[PDB]
Amino acid sequence: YLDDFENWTVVPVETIEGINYYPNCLPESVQRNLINNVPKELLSIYGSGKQSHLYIPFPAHINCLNDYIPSDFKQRLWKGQDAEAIIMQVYNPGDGIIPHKDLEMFGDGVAIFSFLSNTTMIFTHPELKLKSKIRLEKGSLLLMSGTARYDWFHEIPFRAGDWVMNDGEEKWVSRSQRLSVTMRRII
């Protein structure tokens, strides 16, 4: 991310080893139970979205998310175990995050559950001069590991909508408030 990238190519996210995306992973009931039980202050629609760090033991409305993370992922990367460290982050329209790689204190395998509304995440590789985009939908799970987690940067653009292609038309879809829950372990 430094703009306008004419030397660069946009590739399918399927080319990035260690991206696994599961649409409609969480039932609506699970999403509503979670949202109902976040402190109301965290969900303010005004100004920049707030954030909350949680650590074991998590309450049931959070802790249940561990059950929707694929067992093969936890076996391969988390020594069969469940998440230890969780950040809940709200994004009001215009909020995002600059390109980064998650801190080395976390080791491999990062799980991100999405709530409330859809957004677009962009992966960047400066050395390859490549970009890739993924639409993170309400109720989805993103797993980031390996090449995705170490070689590439990820970001969420600071804007109020996203151009989204569907059924051959491209629309500007305004963003609504979004909440993510990021689940990690500590080395």
What is the contact surface with Fe ion in residues (CB under 5 A)?
102
| Whole-number Cα distances in Å, 39 to 49, 50, 51, 138 | 13, 11, 11, 19
Q: Whose Cβ is closer to Fe ion: residue 33's or residue 87's? A: 87
> Minimum CB separation from Fe ion for residue 47, in Å?
22
Interatomic CA distance for residues 164 and 53, integer angstroms: 31
> Minimum CB separation from Fe ion for residue 79, in Å?
22
Q: Whose Cβ is closer to Fe ion: residue 46's or residue 155's? A: 155
| Whole-number Cα distances in Å, 57 to 5, 38, 64, 70, 82 | 44, 16, 12, 21, 11
> Minimum CB separation from Fe ion for residue 21, in Å?
15
Query: How, if at all, do strands 9-10 and 130-136 pair?
Result: parallel
Q: Whose Cβ is closer to Fe ion: residue 34's or residue 112's? A: 112
> Minimum CB separation from Fe ion for residue 43, in Å?
21
- Residue with CB nearest Fe ion? 102
Q: Whose Cβ is closer to Fe ion: residue 17's or residue 28's? A: 17
